[PDB]
């Protein structure tokens, strides 16, 4: 069917592939989703501020 | 591609182990008894039935001999060789011999006669034919902790069995024990029920002690106990014998290796040490008439040790451990070993042997028919090297030249 | 000198000048043992015919110089 070299190539391919290695989707509650949004938005704002500070300097 | 009946072994083995003694003439010969040696002083003599039974168990009759030639193994009594030795054994205060001589002269045969005598005179016999088995490394062994030496619990078991069977039980069970003895049980029966076997002082017997069956690690302990018991008892004589003692003398270090890869010393073993102790004035038997009879074999190596031990050569200190072990010599000197040289056959003895062989029908046709008898005897004597019995026998039977 | 005692084989060379300034050492020795004192020096070892350029790595330290200048040409057969 397959050689040892062929097997090892398949294994190598698998290492890179998403076949049966990836978890379930990250589902959130609505409150949790909001909390996440507020975390991300604030962070983004902070990053923008920092960029402006550096740019201004 | 082999059947039960067919001979698969090599020659010497075949002659020992395939019963070609079957097809042989029955011979009504006289019986070996020391009390009636005057009757049969220079004649061929078959052993008694009891003696035979004992002797076979001990391991007196050996493979390279021509015991296949007759119905059963046979010897003749000799005034110069065997009778004199017996007298010495009877008379001497020490009673401690080493049977020396040239290869094939009849040391074993002398040992067998001594055993037979002991059997007749109500004595226990601890025979160690072929120490090569315990000395060379071809069976299991283990370092005992209580006894500071290496035990060998396959050989030991066999030796115990031989002791049990060679000797009659009435003589052996006349001995009460000095101490009590605990042993590990190793029966198929009563394994879970009886974890230990106990022998009491007065109630139990030496026979019972011998019949004990333990695990390998207690076998050496059992052996030690038995020896001690035999040393203590004064009711029966104990004949210790070791044939091919030459091997023991020469093979100072065994083939066994301890935890670190180096050879174990003979005196660091159980059996060899025990044997040495018996030889020397150390494990002294309580009874008189209790002898040690050692025997050299021409098979084995020769070196300076045994001559130095005896009154032969002055002690050269520079010769190597391989060719001269001084400890063994010292041990031999400690237990006063008086050596016994086996003399070669006289003309008359040779003639008598030849006559016996003729009666049994071993002689060839060219020897018997068309030949003077005296001349034939003289030729036989010449070819043996003036009465080496084995050589003579070989010339008679195994020549075909 | 092969035997560990008495070794190792030493020959006179223009070593120090090579060390100071990268001038290759044209050896016609071929039986001088390589040493730790010349790793990373350019040698031009004789081949019988033509001197062979070699840069001595740390793997060469035990060996002779002539071991890295192969004298005979690689054998072939003219299939006629």
């Amino acid at each position: 069917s397959l050689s040892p070299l062929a097997q090892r190539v398949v294994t190598q391919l698998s290492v890179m592939s998403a076949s049966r290695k990836q978890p379930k989707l990250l589902k959130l509650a609505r409150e949790d989703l909001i909390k996440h949004q507020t975390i991300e938005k604030c962070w983004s704002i902070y990053q923008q501020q920092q960029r402006e500070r550096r740019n201004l300097q | 591609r082999v059947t039960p009946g067919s001979l698969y072994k090599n020659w010497t083995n075949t002659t020992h182990t395939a019963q070609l003694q079957q097809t042989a003439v029955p011979l009504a010969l006289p019986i070996f008894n020391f009390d009636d040696i005057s009757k049969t002083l220079n004649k061929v003599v078959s052993y008694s039935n009891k003696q035979y039974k004992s002797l076979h168990h001990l391991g007196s009759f050996k493979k390279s001999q021509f015991n296949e030639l007759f119905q059963k193994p046979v010897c003749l009594v000799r005034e110069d060789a065997t009778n004199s030795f017996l007298k010495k054994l009877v008379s001497h205060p020490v009673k401690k011999f080493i049977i020396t001589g040239e290869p094939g002269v009849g040391k074993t045969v002398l040992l067998s006669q001594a055993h037979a005598y002991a059997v007749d005179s109500k004595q226990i016999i601890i025979n160690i034919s072929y120490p090569e088995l315990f000395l060379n490394g071809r069976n299991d062994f283990s370092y005992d902790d209580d006894l500071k030496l290496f035990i060998q619990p396959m050989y030991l078991k066999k030796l115990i069995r031989k002791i049990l069977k060679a000797n009659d039980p009435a003589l052996l069970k006349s001995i009460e024990l000095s101490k009590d003895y605990k042993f590990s049980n190793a029966n198929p029966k009563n394994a879970s029920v009886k974890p230990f076997v106990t022998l009491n002082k007065t109630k139990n017997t030496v026979l019972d002690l011998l019949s004990v069956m333990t695990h390998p690690h207690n076998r050496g302990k059992l052996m030690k106990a038995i020896i001690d018991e035999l040393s203590v008892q004064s009711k029966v004589p104990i004949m210790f014998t070791v044939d091919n003692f030459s091997k023991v003398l020469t093979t100072a270090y065994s083939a066994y290796r301890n935890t670190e890869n180096k050879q174990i010393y003979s005196l660091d073993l159980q059996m060899g040490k025990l044997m040495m102790d018996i030889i020397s004035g150390e494990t002294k038997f309580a009874n008189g008439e209790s002898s040690t009879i050692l025997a050299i074999s021409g098979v084995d190596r020769t070196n300076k040790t045994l001559p130095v031990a005896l009154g032969k050569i002055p002690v050269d200190p520079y010769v190597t451990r391989y060719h001269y072990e001084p400890k063994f010599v010292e041990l031999l000197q400690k237990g006063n070993v008086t050596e016994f040289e086996v003399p070669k056959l006289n003309k008359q003895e040779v003639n008598e042997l030849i006559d016996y062989y003729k009666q049994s029908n071993v002689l060839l046709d060219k020897d018997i028919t068309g030949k003077k008898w005296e001349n034939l005897i003289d030729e036989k004597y010449f070819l043996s090297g003036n009465g080496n019995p084995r050589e003579l026998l070989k010339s008679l039977v195994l020549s075909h030249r | 000198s092969r035997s560990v005692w008495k070794g190792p084989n030493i020959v006179p060379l223009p070593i120090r000048e090579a060390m100071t300034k990268g001038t290759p050492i044209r050896t016609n020795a071929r039986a001088a043992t390589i040493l730790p004192q010349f790793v990373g020096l350019k040698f031009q070892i004789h081949n019988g015919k033509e001197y062979v350029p070699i840069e001595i790595s740390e793997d060469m330290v035990g060996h002779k110089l002539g071991e890295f200048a192969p004298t005979r040409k690689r054998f072939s057969y003219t299939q006629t």
Partner: protein, 93 residues
């Protein structure tokens, strides 16, 4: 002639359902030539590595600042610089 792995029918990733390849990675500590440790994410399972030949001991990256081993071992009694000076006559070349 051409060595290949022959393809099976491809699995249909639906539009929107495609997920990004987040490979399994460990936080790995690299101690460089000197004792400066640096954390890097790595796919091979080894929490700690210490490096021998780095930029922090290479002369190009800081200008201002086992055959050989075997040889050293078995020519140790002689102790083999002074030896160089002794065995370096630069006349013959």
């Amino acid at each position: 002639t051409r060595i290949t792995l022959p393809r099976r029918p491809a699995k249909k990733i639906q539009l929107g359902k495609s997920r990004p390849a987040i490979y399994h990675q460990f936080n790995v500590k690299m101690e460089l030539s000197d004792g400066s440790v640096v954390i890097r994410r790595s796919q091979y399972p080894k929490g700690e590595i210490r490096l021998i030949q780095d930029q922090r001991n290479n002369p190009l990256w800081n200008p201002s600042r086992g055959s050989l081993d075997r040889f050293n071992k078995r020519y140790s009694s002689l102790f083999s610089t002074v030896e160089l000076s002794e065995e370096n006559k630069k006349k013959t070349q």
